[PDB]
């Protein structure tokens, strides 16, 4: 199954937006000490954290207090990580986000499940105190989870600097929703060279930083342009030379030709390490025109 | 009897293509760990592999996992390879394709059967991961079997760089359907130089690689042109200088002349080793007239 | 008695053609391990050679397999070989050909019977395997059998590229049918110089090859022209400057004169080795008008 | 008595010709190894040769086999040679002709009977075997027989090469007809000189080659012309200057004059050896008129 959980106030916003837009095959869960935030957020399972220590009045800038509030409701928390694929979303540098995420990642690992972590670095102007905590959380998180995706918040101010705040954070959510709606297709309707969950587990096992996302294109070179757009999202870290895995899930129509598929494979292969491990596969449907989607994963 | 067994996703695709086209005298069997592929494939015997290890997910990029999975259900596959002629079709460089090829080819050999392997090399621009294990599978398969046919996908891009997705793989499948039609044609319709399965098991139990496939012609030199077309199929490998077999099966109408038949034999006789062995045969019927087919097998 | 047996596919074809045309005073036997050929052949006494070792599929390019199969079923085969005149016809190169002709010839020889063998050589452009195998078979047959008749198959190519294989192998059948109808004539309708089987046993026992055959003529020099046509028959390029036998059997009508008969004898007596043993004979009837048949058993 | 026995195919043909023509006072016997010829020969006593050595098929161009076969049935053979005058007809150079003929000759000689043998040399263009066999047979026969007659077949070519074989051989039969008719006309009916069997025994006792024949004439010199025709028959041409016998007896009519008889006597003695006895004679009957026959048994 697919379970996406949000730890901290930042994670609750991502869970809220993801649930508002709606996804298929994924279950939304929110974990946060402050009961005030959980009241306004919308999801299915709202597992309140350690009220016996926090009572629901926030954590503050102390990851130790977040960890102490965590690792107390583990008996209740263990039931939610009993799935196949999990997406832990947490804004680092805060309170419960930097403390509950490590213990939840370890708990999900002990349940033998694939983990993907979505973190967001704080604004540079927030302060050295606010950024050191986020760096500490990020460095220790990659030792537990096998895939970490980092979205620097200040990057939003360099790509989309004129929006009504919420939609500025919508770009950060775009990566997560795209990855979830792409993976839920990779574990769905097959065809030709269709992949399954085993390939996903192989491509996302003990690697580190990862890049995921999808795009669309309806030009003459539909597959190539869609892949190029998906692999180069503006708000992601531009570092793909040191990559040792890949996954391509072209979902074009009958108009797609073998030359275009081979060109897409060449374009993904030429931008990463020569000794890469490409696990591709094409799903084909006789309902759409030249438009071709492209789900891409790197690590 | 004639059995065609597919291994891996490529094997399932080839078996589906053969079943849709319709083959006389052949029985289709598909074996692959991924239960999704077997669910969405078309075949008579759908023998699932060792789900006790990797139920319904797939071997990924791990030939050893497929090797272990096949050995789990080795008893179930022993009762299906107990035939006369077997065609193991599997796309090398993958998962179960590279792992269920060795143990099933050996299993078929222990039943005293004539083995023909149809494999497809992966794309050159697809990473060294897909290429090294494909080479390993080819090297181990030529050891366990006596006839191996290789059709690299790159050649397809140099033959049909256009048309829909399935047409390229159908062109890859053309040689196998042509060969299975030729083999099932020798058993029926005895001719003047009538051949039988004993002659077939003279050129397929020796040497390594081989080239098979039929063709058609309707000009004045019908037999000669048909033989020249069948001997030089585009996507097949071009190596006829080092050949030590021939199974020419000129099957034309009464309009065929002795000069044309002798010329057709001499055409293949002059393009192979001087010390080669020819086991030719001819079938004559009054229903095709000028049109003459030509089934050719090398080694 | 007159018995003609055929070993191999070529032997079966010759037996079928001879039965189709019809022969009086002769019996037809077919021996070939390939039960597929026997199922569609036309004859009277069919013996399936090698019922155990071959199983009825075929022999392939293995004369040793044919030899073993012949040795397997000697008991049921010796019964039919007990006669006076036997015609063993075969196509060299095959498993049931060169590997099964010497054994049956030896069985006939150790039965006190006159043995005549007719072999068909393979096409020159069929590799060194067929040529060497045919040479070995001919060498091992001429030692045992007393009179062989060799018609290379390329003679049909370089003489009559007229019709299909079904109507050009009939041109190679002319030798055997002409010999049989013309040997069965000696045992009927005694003439003025009446001959019988005791003379045949003398003329067809020297050694080596023979050019037996018959022809007809209707011109003023009926006997001479018919004899010249019969002795220099096509497909027989073997030089006849050396010979030690003759069975001229002029069977003309009352119009024949002493001068014409003497010229018919002399034309043969001048075209062969100077010292020779002519066993000529003449049959005269008031029904053929001017036509004169020219049966000759020159060896 | 007069018995004519034929050995060999030529002997059987001559016996059939003589029986068809009809001769009074003579008995026809045919002896031949092959029963096929005897089944069609028109004769009274058909005594088969040595079936025990060889069945009734043929001799096989071998004098030894025929001679050995004759010795097998000597007991039955002797039953017929117990007569006064015997005519052994045999075609030399063949099988039983060079076989039973010497043994029947010696049997007749032992039985104290007058022996005359008629042989026919084979055609010159029939190889060295036939001529050598004929020479050996003639040399052997002249030893054990008191008189032989040789009429080579090649001589008929220079006399009447425009007649059918069945009728032109009757031209060679005229010698035996004249011999068997002149002898009968001596023993039967009286004459003025009245020669009997004593003179015949005198003129045919251990001499060798001889010329025997009769002729008719009706000119003014009937007796002179009739004698000259019978003394110079076109078939047998030998130097008569060395002859040592004569049986010139005539059968003229009343018109015959003493001068004509003296001239008929003198003409023979003019062209032969001046020595040796001329046992002449005359028969007179009042029916012939000017027509006068002439029989000569010159030796
Ligand atoms: N990209 C985004 N970052 C966010 C968002 N909301 C908060 N954040 C970031 O996350 C960080 C704050 O983390 P939290 O809200 O989990 C802090 P804490 O657990 O102490 O929250 P309370 O207990 O509710 O006070 C900080 O760097 C923010 O800039 C959002 O909607 N998008
Ligand atoms: N010529 C073709 N090659 C194919 C086709 N499908 C797959 N392949 C090739 O075969 C290889 C993939 O092999 P498989 O599908 O057996 C890999 P695996 O066993 O891991 O499949 P899953 O367990 O379903 O993931 C790869 O090189 C493909 O390019 C096809 O239809 N035609
Ligand atoms: N002149 C002819 N040659 C023939 C004919 N059929 C076969 N052949 C020749 O004979 C040879 C083939 O021999 P066979 O048919 O006996 C082969 P084999 O004994 O292996 O029979 P199978 O087991 O049925 O294959 C080859 O040289 C042919 O060219 C025919 O009808 N005519
Ligand atoms: N003048 C004739 N010569 C004849 C005649 N028939 C045969 N011959 C000659 O006699 C010779 C043949 O002798 P035979 O017929 O006795 C030979 P053989 O005893 O072997 O006869 P078969 O046993 O019947 O084969 C040969 O030279 C012939 O030319 C005939 O009708 N007339």
Residue numbers in the entry:
A (entry chain A), B (entry chain B), C (entry chain C), D (entry chain D): 34 to 332
From the paper:
FtsZ, a tubulin superfamily protein, is an essential player in cell division in many bacteria and archaea. FtsZ filament formation is GTP-dependent, and results in a GTP hydrolysis site at the interface of two monomers, as is the case with α/β-tubulin. An Asgard archaeon, Candidatus Odinarchaeum yellowstonii LCB_4 (Class Odinarchaeia) (hereafter referred to as Odinarchaeota) uniquely possesses both, a tubulin-like gene and two FtsZ genes. Overall, we report the presence of two distant evolutionary paralogs of FtsZ in Odinarchaeota, with distinct filament assemblies and differing modes of membrane targeting.
For cryo-EM analysis, we incubated OdinFtsZ1 with 2 mM GMPCPP on ice to promote the formation of relatively straight filaments. This enabled visualization of thin filaments, resembling the single protofilaments typically seen in other canonical FtsZs. After refining the helical parameters, the 3D map was constructed that represents a single protofilament of OdinFtsZ1 with a 44.5 Å helical rise and a –2.72° helical twist. Although the overall resolution of the final reconstructed 3D map is ~3.6 Å (FSC = 0.143), the map quality was poor for reliable main-chain tracing in some regions, and the resolution estimated from the atomic model (dmodel or map vs model at FSC 0.5) was limited to 4.1 Å. The map revealed the canonical FtsZ/tubulin fold, featuring an N-terminal nucleotide-binding domain (NTD) and a C-terminal GTPase activating domain (or CTD). The CTD is composed of a four-stranded β-sheet flanked by two α-helices on each side with a long central helix (H7) connecting the two domains, consistent with the AlphaFold structure prediction. The N-terminal domain consists of six β-strands arranged into a sheet, flanked by two α-helices on one side and three on the other. A non-protein density was detected within the nucleotide-binding pocket using Servalcat into which GMPCPP was modeled. The phosphate binding loops T1 (residues 39–45), T2 (residues 65–68), T3 (residues 90–96) and T4 (residues 124–130) (Löwe J, 1998) surround the nucleotide GMPCPP. Although Mg²⁺ was included in the incubation mixture, no corresponding density was observed.
